[PDB]
Design a protein around this nucleic acid. Sequence first.
DNA 1: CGACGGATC
DNA 2: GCTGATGCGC
DNA 3: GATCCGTCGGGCGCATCAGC
Length: 297
Amino acid sequence: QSEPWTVLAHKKPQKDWKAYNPKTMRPPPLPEGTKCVKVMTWNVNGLRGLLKFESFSALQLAQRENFDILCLQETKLQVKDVEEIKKTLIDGYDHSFWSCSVSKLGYSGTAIISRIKPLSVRYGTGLSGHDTEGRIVTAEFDSFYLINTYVPNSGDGLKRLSYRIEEWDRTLSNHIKELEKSKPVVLTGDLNCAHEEIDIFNPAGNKRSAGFTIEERQSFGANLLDKGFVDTFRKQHPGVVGYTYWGYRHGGRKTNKGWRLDYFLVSQSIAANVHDSYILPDINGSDHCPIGLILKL
DNA sequence: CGACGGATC
DNA sequence: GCTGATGCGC
DNA sequence: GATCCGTCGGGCGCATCAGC
Ligand SMILES: *O[C@H]1CCO[C@@H]1COP(=O)(O)O
């Protein structure tokens, strides 16, 4: 009730399944002398909105969880609004990279804020440049790549399901795999798919809802996992029900009636270096909550 | 997106 | 130029 | 017993506009 995630919420669960509790299921902090990267990812549902929330201060988050790189989705920013925010950004993180939808305005929008100068930063899939909907940001680091994405929602009526499955999902795969040729890859963001029924509260009701269509779930396996990539949370907390998105319509958060739509998918070659893929259901301000990764470098 | 029939499988 | 209302995808 | 379909309906951030 003050921690409603700790309660298991599911329409057709299984007895083995236990609800994720970060305070008990998270490994202890890593040893002092460990080359680690700590990333965080959050679909803020409007960056401007979020900065104007209860008492939100990015600085607090970066103090609370001491993240090295922050990945944001659905900034809802225009390329005009970037310079202002880029200053107000978390102080101490001065290398920030932003991508905004230029078509539908105040929609979509990705961003990577880091205190580690990347070796390079490119937007969109390949040298095609910024995605029109500002949905892809890719950053090269010394040992790996980090792709932040806000996958296009197939929409109500699934009127974008064909674009999603036949175009987006494919190109995102091809982008990732081309990169893996050189350095390993870490994909994160709002992938907009609950892979399994453990990743959703009402699997049956949402069989034709965007996010849980068999088509989208197959593509997740086919275009991504079955092509060399690992769901960091799922490998670490098998049979644990943790959600990353709760709707506003019915206060799903107060009832943990949630989906898991945000991931940290990593290449197999690096899956052992994963220390903790986690979820922070406590941090409000968005219909999504933050998720984090601690990767031994 | 959850939740609710009634009709359908 | 400012606000409440509207519209639309999430 | 389940799935299906058709419906509602105290949601939200942002852009745009009417009407001051
Ligand atoms: O219906 C919800 C759950 C699956 O997709 C929408 C959420 O959209 P995102 O904010 O995840 O794009």
